[PDB]
């Protein structure tokens, strides 16, 4: 059967169709689009009846009552007729409120919280909101189970209504025990250190909610929920229980292979934010090719003290050889130590202050214009006519940072914003004299009340410059392109492109291609597509997070699908367009690269997997596209 007609009789203030438009039960379904069905059922009729009651109550009709409702069906049992008899009554305006009862000394707050504009129309939804907000106010002071009722008294002579509300706060409840359930791997202290409600203290509903939201922002759990059931037999004692379930945070992968493009490869990667349930953030990246020997260990203890002070330490080593046997080609050794200290200054703000040392060893660099600008900034004058050169620097950096984190949730936020500023400056005595600032923002604005439709605005900013006449080193250059930046482009390719001097190329073999090899007869310097990045960067993106159109409820919480639009550019502020006129101007930031496409993020058992497909609808010469991209982590 199906709904044949929804009819309202006795209504005069509003159109019958307008009254029906709020009902879940649909009188008619349009032919040009699908928005529902007319399948009648008893349960949603009560909800629509309550909705109709609320719609009449929030327009001053305090005397509203439903006389009766008649569900009827055709003799052939295919059609359903629903009719409701309505007595609207007169329209009334709220003439004032009166508060009485045991207010427990909170009268100055209750009377102000229940204050109204005189002569305003009566609103049942406002009455219910007031009833709940009084409960919230009393619960913030430990009165977790108050007794509050409000009855409207109606004057049929004056056409006004008075709300006499009775309030009894009851006993102030104390919490004796806080329990955690489902933390199979996470240490109890990890959950307990996010608390703001203390055991053996009077209850705070705001404190419990803040503890719940901090556990949500921690990111190690999901579907965090609370209950505050009373201890049996006691006038005022409660047990506050936090129920969580644990996900496999992070990922670990390794790979060994032979005879590939990189030769014999051994690449591994570790990333856990909740290492063994201890709360430590541990990352162990590394690879061993014929061309690179890399290892990076980063361990952070977010609660080095009980107050939340963090103590991070990053140790890394990078060694790149552009050729295996001859050892005369490009070589880049990079190793250093980075220890950082972070502490919170507010409920949502934290500051970082650390020291960083890095050693870079360069030899046989292939001539490039911006690189040579950097070398002349450092005071060295190697020869530009050949690839015989070397440069070596030890740098000490004061690393500082500030993070604002009011996100709704740790992994897939639906409300709030995160801002993460990171900065560095060289301590005097270092070889390089430079500074760097990086700002990352991510703001989530939910479109629907269920937070299924969220719009996300991500902006990523970067700037670096030299401090004492010397320039910012090119190993600190920004890069764009890939999953972590503007999508749809080849990874780390967006930005300035290298311009190569005509030079004697090392280990030259005639059957390969070289950018300005003098063996090829290169009279003048080459324009190329080889990306070197730039000292400045500005990347922005707007994403529309949408529900997955085919997923089930049990998998919906781990799959995120979104349409996106990326904006970004990387440029070299110190580039000189006057000296190099015919070559492209890399000092211009106006070459913003754009792309739009679909992204799918998945909390897989193999770790967070992100699948993306983007079309670079704005693209410039000397750049290449990669539409389909994927990431192994986050």
């Amino acid at each position: 059967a199906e709904i044949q007609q929804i009819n309202i009789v006795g209504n005069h203030a509003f159109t019958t169709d307008e009254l029906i438009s709020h009902f879940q039960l649909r009188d008619e379904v349009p032919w040009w689009n699908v928005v529902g069905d007319r399948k009648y059922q008893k349960q949603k009729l009560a909800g629509d009846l309550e909705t109709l009651r609320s719609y009449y109550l929030d327009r001053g009709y305090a005397r509203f009552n439903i006389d009766s409702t008649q569900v009827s069906l055709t003799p052939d049992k295919k059609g359903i007729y629903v009719t409701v008899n309505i007595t609207e009554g007169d329209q009334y305006k709220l003439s004032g409120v009166e508060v009485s009862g045991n207010l427990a000394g909170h009268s100055a707050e209750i009377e102000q919280l229940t204050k109204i504009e005189p002569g305003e129309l009566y609103n049942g939804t406002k009455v219910t909101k007031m009833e709940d907000d009084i409960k919230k106010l009393l619960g913030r002071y430990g009165y977790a189970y108050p007794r509050v009722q409000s009855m409207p008294e109606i004057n049929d002579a004056d056409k006004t209504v008075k709300l006499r509300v009775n309030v009894d706060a009851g006993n102030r409840f104390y919490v004796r025990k806080i329990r955690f359930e489902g933390n199979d791997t996470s240490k109890d202290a990890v959950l307990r250190r996010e608390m703001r409600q203390m055991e053996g203290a009077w209850l705070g509903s705001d404190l419990v909610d803040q503890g719940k939201e901090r556990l949500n922002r921690l990111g190690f759990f999901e579907t965090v929920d609370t209950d505050t059931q009373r201890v049996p037999g006691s006038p005022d004692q409660v047990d506050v229980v936090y129920k969580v379930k644990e996900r496999n945070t992070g990922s670990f992968n390794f790979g060994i292979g032979y005879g590939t493009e990189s030769g014999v490869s051994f690449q591994a990667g570790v990333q856990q934010d909740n290492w063994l349930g201890t709360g430590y953030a541990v990352g162990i990246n590394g690879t061993k090719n014929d061309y690179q020997t890399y290892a990076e260990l980063s361990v952070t203890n977010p609660y080095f003290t009980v107050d939340g002070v963090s103590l991070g330490g990053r140790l890394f080593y990078n060694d790149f050889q552009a050729d295996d046997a001859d050892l005369s080609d490009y070589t880049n050794k990079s190793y250093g130590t980075d220890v950082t200290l972070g502490f919170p200054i507010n409920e949502y703000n934290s500051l970082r202050a650390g020291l960083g040392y890095v050693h870079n060893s360069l030899s046989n660099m292939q001539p490039q214009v911006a690189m040579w600008r950097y070398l002349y900034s450092m005071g060295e004058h190697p020869s530009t006519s050949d690839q015989d050169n070397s440069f070596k620097t030890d740098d000490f950096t004061f690393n500082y940072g500030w993070t604002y984190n009011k996100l709704d949730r740790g992994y897939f936020p639906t409300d709030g914003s995160r801002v993460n500023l990171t900065g560095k400056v060289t301590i005097p005595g270092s070889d390089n004299e430079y500074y760097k600032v990086t700002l990352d923002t991510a703001t989530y604005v939910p479109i629907d009340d269920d937070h299924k439709w969220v719009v996300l605005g991500r902006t990523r900013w970067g700037y670096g410059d030299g401090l004492g006449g010397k320039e910012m080193p090119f190993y600190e250059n920004f890069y764009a392109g890939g999953s972590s930046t503007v999508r749809g482009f080849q990874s780390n390719t967006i930005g300035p492109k290298a311009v190569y001097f005509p030079h004697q190329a090392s280990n030259y073999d005639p059957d390969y291609d070289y950018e300005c090899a003098t063996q090829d007869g290169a009279k003048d310097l080459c324009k190329s597509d080889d990306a070197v990045g730039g000292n400045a960067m500005a990347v922005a993106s707007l994403e529309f997070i949408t529900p997955t159109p085919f997923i089930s409820d049990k998998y919906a919480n781990s799959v995120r699908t979104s349409f996106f639009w990326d904006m970004g550019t990387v440029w070299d502020t110190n580039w000189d367009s006057s000296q190099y006129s015919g070559y492209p101007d890399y000092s211009d930031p106006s070459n913003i690269r754009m792309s739009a496409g679909i992204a799918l993020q998945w909390m897989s058992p193999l770790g967070p997997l992100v699948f993306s497909y983007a079309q670079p609808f704005k693209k410039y010469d000397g750049d290449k596209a990669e539409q389909f991209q994927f990431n192994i982590g986050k």
Partner: peptide, 15 residues
Amino acid sequence: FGTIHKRRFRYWFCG
């Protein structure tokens, strides 16, 4: 999850 390609072995760890 593990994958062996032509003389190339990969692995991912769950749990």
